[PDB]
């Protein structure tokens, strides 16, 4: 399915990041067949219209669009990238690297909170924002 819009070349990506001025651009780098990307994209579609006011989601295929692999260290099976007014926003998830999510959370509310915090920090002017949760521990007991 994947009703979320897709970008088929680097040109689409680099004018999609600059297209939004009052909304956070979300880019999922990965592959549809990849299950983890499947989980994240299901979560995103579950909240695609909830964050329409202040966020936008685009799906980018690594094979179709491989130019960002070296610059963004796109070596994981899947990454999630946050941009605002041409500036990347780093998120302090507690996983060691603040640039990309690199994992698929099943709860859509966690992603909603993450994108809301990113928007709040980007409109205020901070380039690095703190996640309102710690993902170092999976919280499984």
């Amino acid at each position: 399915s994947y009703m979320l819009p897709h970008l088929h070349n680097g040109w689409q990506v680099d004018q999609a990041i600059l297209s939004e001025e009052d909304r956070v651009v979300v880019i999922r780098f990965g592959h549809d067949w990849d299950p983890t990307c499947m989980k994240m994209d299901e979560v995103l579609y579950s909240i695609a219209e909830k964050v329409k006011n202040f966020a936008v989601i685009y799906l980018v295929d690594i094979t179709e669009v491989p130019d960002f692999n070296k610059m963004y260290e796109l070596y994981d099976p899947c990454t999630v990238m946050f941009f605002f007014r041409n500036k990347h926003i780093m998120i302090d998830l507690g996983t060691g690297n603040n640039n990309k999510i690199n994992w698929a959370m099943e709860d859509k509310q966690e992603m909603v909170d993450i994108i809301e915090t990113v928007y709040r920090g980007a409109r205020k002017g901070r380039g690095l924002v703190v996640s309102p949760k710690d993902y170092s521990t999976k919280y499984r007991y």
């Binding site: 994947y2 819009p5 549809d32």
Partner: peptide, 13 residues
Amino acid sequence: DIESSLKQLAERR
């Protein structure tokens, strides 16, 4: 649009 991604998914799976 959706069919273009469905064909890519089916071919790769």
